[PDB]
Write a protein that binds this ligand. Structure first.
Ligand SMILES: N#CCNS(=O)(=O)c1ccc(Nc2ncc(Br)c(Nc3cccc(F)c3C(N)=O)n2)cc1
Lengths: 261, 297
């Protein structure tokens, strides 16, 4: 009942709707003059560092990334201000999701005093105006936590590796902005399942979501390439974060050579 | 848009900020505000307001207050809601001698259950259900209000804030310091309100945490491993708790019928796993003759 079943279905269905309305513009980085995908990846890696520094929830990081993507889809921002956005979002998510969010002074501190408290508060104001206060956005984590319940006997390694892949998907705007959060969650779940146990996307999840393995195939391919190239990726904070026993050190597992899809 | 409003009076103070009754000079629409003096060199936009606005933009339901607009200036923040005529606590007080007729109590509980079922189906916990947050109009409707303490939860829930519910309506699993808590708490609150609607006085008017626990025990019996598996292992549980016997509800809520007593017993169940859900409560035999009478302020 703490895995609330009586309203269970409805919630999932509702998320499948909401994730459509909160989707940012896929090619927004092509319209941004001063920033690139690599700069966004650096920002997300720093946000991972922040979340691990203040022991914040993964859902908070996912919400912050979603807010940043939705803000940059309609606002052109110079590079020297990018962090500020990424800060305010990380603040807002902290206020939305965390029980004890870090105070504004701490966020100003972790920027190494790059910005002032006034600037952070005003950027929070601006982000709230731009997003029309639609901060309850569905995340890959929210779908992963629901997909986890369908495991034949649950595995800690599978859960940790799926969460690891879900966080990895946040770094690369290309091509992961193409896919919906539910699709990314399904791809990560299937990849972890095949890596650890060799099992496949279960039938129960096909009935629940309507996604088939064929439908997930493109996201599976992209996420598999990302998983294979992860050690060589310029951003490495997620692998270091998932080295710890808190996630059973699944970051250093051997990825499968092929998926036999 | 904020020059377009005539403040008529102060209504009261809510979960946070001040609430005013005001009128729109151009459309004539009478509305209720919510003023939040933001600040600068402070924490900025409070999490309560953020949660309230973000969640109410999603919760469009007849039994949930409609949020019409948010007037966002750099100095203050104003929320604009449909104006309702009265809250449930003043209505109870005005009726503490005559009483609320059974059909009206049944209709109000039915509407509240519909609203809570909508909220739970939209992964929202209210966590502050009480008569002050239950608004009535002249047409017999009732609506949930003030989601400042509300928060959006997820499938298997994780640990949330503990210091959350008005004491008299706090579920036992919160008082015992349980790690995970869920929709059930809200149901519990309605249960109390339900009883508070019949007796016209608070069911468990505790003045401290231990007094609230002991009143709940004296009324429903001190829970053990049979009625509530795992109670003895909870962090704030003490085996030295006095062992009271369960009281027959015929004495707890006299004016209530058999079906109403069954519904109230299922709403006040100790085990949150066992406690009835709002969706299931809507199908209770108690509501087969449901109507929508007029309150007459
Ligand atoms: N005198 C006296 C005692 N109050 S009353 O019963 O006369 C009465 C209370 C409220 C209203 N109307 C109304 N319409 C929409 C909203 Br939104 C709203 N908000 C609140 C108002 C006051 C306190 C609150 F906590 C809230 C809240 N929970 O937000 N109030 C009318 C009469």
């Amino acid at each position: 009942v703490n895995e609330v079943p009586d309203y269970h279905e409805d919630i999932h269905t509702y998320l499948r709707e909401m994730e459509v309305k909160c989707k940012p513009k896929v090619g927004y980085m092509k319209k941004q003059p001063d920033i690139t995908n690599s700069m966004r990846a650096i920002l997300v890696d720093w946000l991972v560092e922040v979340g691990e520094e203040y022991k914040l929830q993964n859902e908070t990081l996912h919400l912050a990334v979603n807010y940043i993507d939705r803000f940059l889809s309609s606002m052109s921002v110079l590079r020297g201000k990018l962090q500020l956005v990424g800060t305010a979002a990380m603040l807002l998510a902290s206020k939305f999701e965390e029980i004890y969010p870090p105070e504004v002074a701490e966020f100003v501190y972790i920027t190494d005093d790059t910005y002032t408290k006034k600037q952070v508060l005003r950027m929070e104001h601006l982000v709230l105006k731009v997003l029309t206060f639609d901060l309850a956005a569905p995340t890959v984590n929210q779908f992963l936590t629901q997909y986890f319940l369908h495991q034949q006997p649950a595995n800690c390694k599978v859960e940790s590796l799926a969460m690891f892949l879900g966080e990895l998907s946040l770094i690369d705007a290309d091509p992961y902005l193409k896919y919906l959060p539910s699709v990314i969650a399904g791809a990560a779940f299937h990849l972890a399942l095949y890596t650890v146990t060799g099992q496949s996307w279960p039938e129960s999840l096909i009935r629940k979501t309507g996604y088939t393995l064929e439908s997930l195939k493109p996201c599976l391919m992209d996420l598999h390439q990302t998983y294979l190239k992860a050690p060589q990726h310029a951003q490495q904070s997620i692998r270091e974060k998932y080295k710890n026993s808190k996630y059973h050190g699944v970051s250093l597992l051997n990825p499968p050579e092929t998926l036999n899809l | 848009s904020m020059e377009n409003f005539q403040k008529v009076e102060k209504i009261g103070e809510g979960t946070y900020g001040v609430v005013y009754k005001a009128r729109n000079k151009l459309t004539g629409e009478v509305v209720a505000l919510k003023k939040i003096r933001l600040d600068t060199e402070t924490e900025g936009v409070p999490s309560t307001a953020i949660r309230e606005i973000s969640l109410l933009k999603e919760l469009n339901h007849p039994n949930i207050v409609k949020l019409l607009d948010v007037i966002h200036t750099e100095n203050k923040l104003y929320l604009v809601f449909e104006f309702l005529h009265q809250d449930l606590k003043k209505f109870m007080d005005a009726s503490a001698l005559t009483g609320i007729p059974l059909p009206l109590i049944k209709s109000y509980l039915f509407q509240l259950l519909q609203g809570l079922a909508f909220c739970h189906s939209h992964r929202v916990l209210h966590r502050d259900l009480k008569p002050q947050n239950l608004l009535i109009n002249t047409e017999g409707a009732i609506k949930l209000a003030d989601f400042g303490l509300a928060r959006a939860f997820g499938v298997p829930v994780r640990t949330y804030t503990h210091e959350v519910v008005t004491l008299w309506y706090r579920a036992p699993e919160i008082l015992l310091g349980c790690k995970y808590y869920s929709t059930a708490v809200d149901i519990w609150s309605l249960g109390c309100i339900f009883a508070e609607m019949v007796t016209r006085r608070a069911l468990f008017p505790g003045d401290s945490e231990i007094d609230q626990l002991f009143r709940i025990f004296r009324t429903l019996g001190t829970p053990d491993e049979v009625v509530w598996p795992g109670v003895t292992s909870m962090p704030d549980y003490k085996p030295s708790f006095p062992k009271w016997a369960r009281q027959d509800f015929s004495k707890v809520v006299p004016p209530l019928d058999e079906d109403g007593r069954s519904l109230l017993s299922q709403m006040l169940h100790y085990d949150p796993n066992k406690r009835i859900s709002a969706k299931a409560a809507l199908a209770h035999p108690f509501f087969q003759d449901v109507t929508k009478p007029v309150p007459h302020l």
